[PDB]
Amino acid sequence: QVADLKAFSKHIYNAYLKNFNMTKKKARSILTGKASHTAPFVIHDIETLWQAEKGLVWLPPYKEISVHVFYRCQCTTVETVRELTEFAKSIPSFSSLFLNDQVTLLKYGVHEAIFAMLASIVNKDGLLVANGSGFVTREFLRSLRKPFSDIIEPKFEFAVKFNALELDDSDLALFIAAIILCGDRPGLMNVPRVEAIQDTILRALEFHLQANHPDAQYLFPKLLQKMADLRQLVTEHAQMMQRIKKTETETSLHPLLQEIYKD
Ligand SMILES: O=C(O)CCCCCOc1ccccc1CN(C(=O)c1ccc(-c2ccco2)cc1)C1CC1
Ligand SMILES: CCCCCCCO[C@@H]1O[C@H](CO)[C@@H](O)[C@H](O)[C@H]1O
Ligand SMILES: CCCCCCCO[C@@H]1O[C@H](CO)[C@@H](O)[C@H](O)[C@H]1O
Numbered sequence: 359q360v361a362d363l364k365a366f367s368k369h370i371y372n373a374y375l376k377n378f379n380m381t382k383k384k385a386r387s388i389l390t391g392k393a394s395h396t397a398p399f400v401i402h403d404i405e406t407l408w409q410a411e412k413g414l415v416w417l418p419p420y421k422e423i424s425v426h427v428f429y430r431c432q433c434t435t436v437e438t439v440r441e442l443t444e445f446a447k448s449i450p451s452f453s454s455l456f457l458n459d460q461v462t463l464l465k466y467g468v469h470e471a472i473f474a475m476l477a478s479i480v481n482k483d484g485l486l487v488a489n490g491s492g493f494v495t496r497e498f499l500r501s502l503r504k505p506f507s508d509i510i511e512p513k514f515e516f517a518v519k520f521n522a523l524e525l526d527d528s529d530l531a532l533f534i535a536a537i538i539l540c541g542d543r544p545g546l547m548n549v550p551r552v553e554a555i556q557d558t559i560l561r562a563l564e565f566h567l568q569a570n571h572p573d574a575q576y577l578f579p580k581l582l583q584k585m586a587d588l589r590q591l592v593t594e595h596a597q598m599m600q601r602i603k604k605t606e607t608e609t610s611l612h613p614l615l616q617e618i619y620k621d
Contacts, residue, residue, distance in 0.1 A: 373448035374531035382478035
């Protein structure tokens with residue numbers, strides 16, 4: 359059964375191309391200046407942030423710059439949760455699950471997927487925003503006051519290392535599918551069914567990497583380790599979010615994100 363994993367992989371890639379607004383392909387063309395005549399507007403301080411909000415690029419009541427950026431981060435994660443939900447639903451084996459198990463997988467998997475996909479719009483100097491029309495510098499995000507700068511920097515560190523693996527969109531489609539269809543999530547109802555789906559995806563991933571990266575040694579075990587790394591990254595992220603909820607009482611959290619962090 360070699361030709362069915364290809365079709366299984368092909369369905370997942372099509373679900374990926376069908377549902378995500380930004381591909382790594384498009385992201386990398388922009389970040390390297392080959393995308394178009396127009397380059398992204400660089401946000402590196404308060405003035406350029408204001409100019410970007412004023413129209414050159416682009417919420418709850420305004421509070422301060424660091425909280426405003428945080429709100430922008432929430433806008434992007436919520437929208438990526440939407441895309442991941444439709445991505446997962448475009449996978450027949452995911453849609454076959456009972457709706458409550460679908461929610462459990464997304465609840466505990468979306469942030470791991472978000473921070474994996476985030477690497478696609480990141481370089482060591484910053485990341486793309488607003489569909490690639492802007493670029494926020496890493497230095498500017500580091501300059502935000504704690505705890506908001508603390509919750510951002512670890513994702514850049516993971517991203518730069520992840521990008522060294524040089525995955526393409528067909529690799530990431532399978533990788534993200536494996537994150538969402540994870541049998542370890544708490545409160546899962548049909549654990550054996552999810553684990554069986556996960557296993558098929560991981561077989562399809564290995565097969566796909568052998569075909570797509572023939573000279574890439576150890577790439578499949580490396581990606582399994584990155585899946586474990588994302589669990590730790592998201593664990594640390596949830597802890598920092600708990601601290602924001604305790605100490606930044608004037609900062610609003612989107613209702614959907616509140617439900618994800620309900621525990
Ligand atoms: O837990 C939650 O769901 C909500 C809390 C997330 C807090 C952490 O968010 C981080 C961390 C590191 C890197 C990127 C993001 C957010 N982000 C962005 O695309 C993004 C980043 C910066 C800006 C921006 C606008 C103006 C100046 O900067 C706009 C968008 C991708 C993950 C989604
Ligand atoms: C298939 C449609 C009907 C499904 C009805 C089953 C609802 O179960 C609920 O699923 C939620 C996770 O999704 C959990 O958070 C709740 O604890 C649990 O009670
Ligand atoms: C839309 C995809 C993203 C889903 C976001 C996660 C939703 O949170 C969970 O929704 C369940 C109701 O179904 C509740 O039982 C849980 O208490 C709650 O934690």
